[PDB]
Design a binder for this molecule. Structure first.
Ligand SMILES: CC(=O)N[C@H]1[C@H](O[C@@H]2[C@H](O)[C@@H](O)[C@@H](O[C@H]3[C@H](O)[C@@H](O)[C@@H](O)O[C@@H]3CO)O[C@@H]2CO)O[C@H](CO)[C@H](O)[C@@H]1O[C@@H]1O[C@H](CO)[C@H](O)[C@H](O[C@]2(C(=O)O)C[C@H](O)[C@@H](NC(C)=O)[C@H]([C@H](O)[C@H](O)CO)O2)[C@H]1O
Length: 413
């Protein structure tokens, strides 16, 4: 990263190039920086929503030989209607006089285009489906890396994994733009946006190990993430997804110590014919993470000790258990916050098993997952999980995602 030729970052209260070249950034009047993490840039389908990088003359691409790579993270809202079918739109443009490079999007596609001075084109494409129960890609932060070896191939990587490659040895002189324009160009959906972060340009072909290291290093692994890959936050309502049984959602039979929380039913079907078919995500009891031990910001960090509130009939209850009940599996209840007394409720948050319940002495009661009790999948804390994780890398019932409302998903709250 310290040897990138362009490193676009929000640092010291402004968007600048941190590279040694210090290229000029021109921003339009409708570029939105996420208050929680201002490196997350939102570009709307508006002419004033644009970032233009004016490259130093030293790094403008004009070569038959120079290898180069780009890396960035992108969050692409779900395509909601037929207006998005068959509508390729440019998002990152370094084409001038029908030569250079660009990144483009289409319904279920991320496209890399290289064009030489003879106007010959090579494209590499990542395709993802919107006909999927739970998507890895729709409206979630994904890590893009494109590498170009002028003697061999153009390669697209997604989350550090090679997806597509095409030969480019038959392309000649490439004279790209001296400007890079981040802007939605030719998108017919007026509500479309993208979110982008951590843009870099490199004057080399990155190798698989460098791409994996970049993915790991830009993941911010000390900070817990929500389903969308935004930072997990305190005092923000979350719908819960269990990764072991994703078609079930959380409910509470009754509040109080005699009640329990459990995984039930089937998720709804979100359907727009020929456009998407997904599992509904805004279902079941909402969870809210509350500060207990701690930073003064609202970000949930690895090993933070917290309370979990659950929302039942529009009122907040406390997720808790009597750790003294029979068996390693401790059934969780939703209790009245006042007069909780000495019941076990402190959760250690971990950045897939996120929630380690502790007794008031600071001993592990175990990761929160579930267990079957007479045909009922009750939520439990269980040290069985803690042990199993240390001796296998399988998915367990303690694997959760936290899903807040996000306008890029489009489901009604
Ligand atoms: C399979 C099982 O029951 N495992 C639990 C385990 O049990 C031990 C042993 O494997 C069994 O044979 C069992 O039976 C005894 C019985 O208790 C006695 O009455 C006796 O007379 O008969 C048998 C002995 O002759 O008991 C053994 C230990 O007592 O015990 C451990 C605790 O030591 C757990 O309770 C095991 O159950 C697991 O519990 C955890 C929470 O602790 C989870 O609920 C596990 O479920 C999931 C998961 O959350 O990860 C999810 C699925 O529901 C489950 N799949 C099933 C059950 O079909 C998977 C799956 O087990 C794992 O992925 C392994 O492939 O895990 C839960 O299994």
């Amino acid at each position: 990263i310290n040897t990138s030729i362009l490193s676009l970052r929000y640092e010291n209260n402004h968007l600048i190039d941190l590279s040694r070249y210090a290229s000029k950034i021109n921003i339009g009047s409708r570029v939105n920086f996420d208050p929680i993490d201002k490196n997350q840039i939102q570009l709307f389908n508006l002419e004033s929503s644009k970032i233009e990088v004016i490259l130093k003359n030293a790094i403008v691409y004009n070569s038959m030989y120079e290898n180069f790579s780009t890396s960035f993270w992108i969050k692409i809202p779900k395509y909601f209607s037929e207006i998005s079918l068959n509508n390729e739109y440019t998002i990152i443009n370094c084409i001038e006089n029908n030569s250079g490079w660009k990144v483009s999007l289409n319904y279920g596609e991320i496209i890399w285009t290289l064009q030489d001075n003879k106007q010959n084109i090579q494209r590499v494409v990542f395709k993802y489906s919107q006909m999927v129960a739970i998507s890895d890609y729709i409206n979630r932060w994904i890590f893009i890396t494109i590498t170009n070896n002028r003697l061999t191939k153009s390669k697209i990587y997604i989350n550090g994994r090679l997806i597509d490659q095409k030969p480019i040895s038959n392309l000649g002189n490439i004279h790209a733009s001296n400007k890079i324009m981040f802007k939605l160009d030719g998108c017919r959906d007026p509500r479309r946006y993208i979110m982008i972060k951590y843009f870099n340009l490199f004057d080399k072909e990155l190798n698989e190990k460098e791409i994996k290291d970049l993915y790991d290093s830009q993941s911010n692994s000390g900070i817990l993430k929500d389903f969308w890959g935004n930072y997990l936050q305190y005092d923000k309502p979350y719908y819960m997804l269990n990764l072991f049984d994703p078609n079930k959602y959380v409910d509470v039979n009754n509040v109080g110590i005699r009640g329990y929380m459990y995984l039930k039913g089937s998720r709804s079907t979100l359907l727009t014919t020929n456009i998407y078919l997904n599992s509904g995500l805004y279902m079941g009891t909402k969870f809210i993470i509350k500060k207990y031990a701690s930073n003064k910001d609202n970000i949930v960090r690895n090993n933070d000790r917290v309370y979990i509130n659950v929302v039942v009939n529009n009122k907040e209850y406390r997720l808790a258990t009597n750790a003294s009940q029979a068996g390693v599996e401790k059934i969780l209840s939703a209790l009245e916050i006042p007069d909780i007394g000495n019941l076990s409720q402190v959760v250690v948050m971990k950045s897939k098993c996120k929630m380690n319940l502790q007794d008031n002495n600071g001993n592990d009661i175990g990761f929160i997952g579930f267990h079957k009790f007479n045909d009922i999948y009750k939520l439990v804390a269980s040290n069985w999980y803690n042990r199993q994780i240390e001796i296998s890398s399988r998915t367990f019932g303690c694997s959760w995602e936290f899903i807040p409302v996000d306008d890029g998903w489009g489901e009604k709250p």
